[PDB]
Amino acid sequence: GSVQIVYKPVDLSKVTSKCGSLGNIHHKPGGGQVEVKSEKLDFKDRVQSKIGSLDNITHVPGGGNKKIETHKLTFR
Amino acid sequence: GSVQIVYKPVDLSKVTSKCGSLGNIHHKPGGGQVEVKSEKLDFKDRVQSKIGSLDNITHVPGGGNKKIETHKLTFR
Amino acid sequence: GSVQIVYKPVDLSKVTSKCGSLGNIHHKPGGGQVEVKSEKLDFKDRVQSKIGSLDNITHVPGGGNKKIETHKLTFR
Amino acid sequence: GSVQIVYKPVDLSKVTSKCGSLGNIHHKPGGGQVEVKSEKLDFKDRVQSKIGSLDNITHVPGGGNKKIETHKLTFR
Amino acid sequence: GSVQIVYKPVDLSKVTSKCGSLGNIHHKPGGGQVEVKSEKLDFKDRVQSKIGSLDNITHVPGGGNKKIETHKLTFR
Amino acid sequence: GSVQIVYKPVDLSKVTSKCGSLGNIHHKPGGGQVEVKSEKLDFKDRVQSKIGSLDNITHVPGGGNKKIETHKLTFR
Asked: Could you tell me which residues carry N6,N6-dimethyllysine (chains A, B, C, D, E, F)?
């Protein structure tokens, strides 16, 4: 028999920020230290290893707002 | 027999921030230290390892609002 | 019998950031140190390794707003 | 005062074997099989390890009687 | 005071073997098989390791004789 | 005071073999097989390793005789 699909999501949504100032921000961490010892590394399928990383990050967006949309129709 | 689907979500939502100022922010941790000792690493399928990482992060968005929407229709 | 799909997502959404000023940001991390020791690395299929990475990042966009859209229609 | 030691062991002993024949000897064992699986071997002081050995021995001496002589004098 | 040592061991001992024949000896073992897997070997002081040996030995001395003499005098 | 040592071991001792015949000896082992797998070997002080040896030995002395002497005098 007849199959009919109407997929019609509607979106008027708004993500809004006012800020009067960002400033006087001081990221001043002391000296980090890292050691790793390992004797063999053996990686096979879809492995996503990270070893011994040392990150200092200072992220200061005037907005930094996120809107994420996922729309899926699957038919068999 | 006849199959009819109407998928019609509607969204007028708003995510809103007012801020008068961000500032005088001091991320000042003392010196971190990390050590890892291991004998063999042997990773097979879809492994997502992290070893011995050391992160300092200072994230200061003026907004930083998140709206996340997932819409799925599955038919067989 | 007949199969009919109407896929008609509609989107008027807006992501808005006002910031009065960005300034006076100081990323002054201390001297980091990293060591990694290994004898053999043996990587095969879809491996995405990182070893010993030291990073300092200062990211200060006037916007930094993200709108992300994924649309998938799959038929069999 | 005066110390006198006389160490004077005497030995006239005899170890004797008579045999009319050795023979018609058949060392015919079926095929042996050995497996060892281990992660690490880490040996420190005066270690005398044997791992996974497989011995067939056929020892057929005409005598097999034993003489070894060891003499030690230690003074302080 | 005076120290006197007379160390005067005496030995007339005899080791005697008579055999009328050695023979018709058949060392015929089936095929041996050995496997060893280990990931690291790490040996430090006076280590005397053997790994995965496979020995067939046929020893048939009529005499084969060993006389071993060790004499030590140590003074301080 | 006076220290006197007489070290005077005396030895008339004898090792003796008669054999009427050696012969008809058959060392016929089946085909041996050995495998060893290891990823690193790290040996330091007075290490005496053997790995994966495969010995067939046939030893058949009528005489083959050994006399071994060690004499040590040490004074301080």
From this structure: 8
CA distance E7 to E69: 16
Please, which residues bridge with residue B66 across strands?
A66
- Specified resolution (Å): 3.0
Give the pair of three-digit tokens for residue D54.
């497989």
Q: How was this structure determined?
A: cryo-EM
Q: State the amino acid at position A14 in one-letter form.
A: K
Count of Cβ atoms closer than 10 Å to residue B50 Cβ: 13
Q: Residue E39: its chain A contacts at CB < 8 A? A: 39-40
Nearest-CA neighbor of E47 among A39, D37, F55, D41?
Answer: D41
CB A60 within 8 A of CB C22: yes
φ/ψ (deg, to 5) at C13: -65, 145
DSSP D30: -
Q: Is E64 helix (H, G, I), strand (E, B) or coil?
A: coil
Element (H, E) at F54: strand F54-59
Residues F6/F35, Cβ–Cβ less than 8 Å: no
From the CA of D66, how many Å to the nearest CA of chain E?
Answer: 8
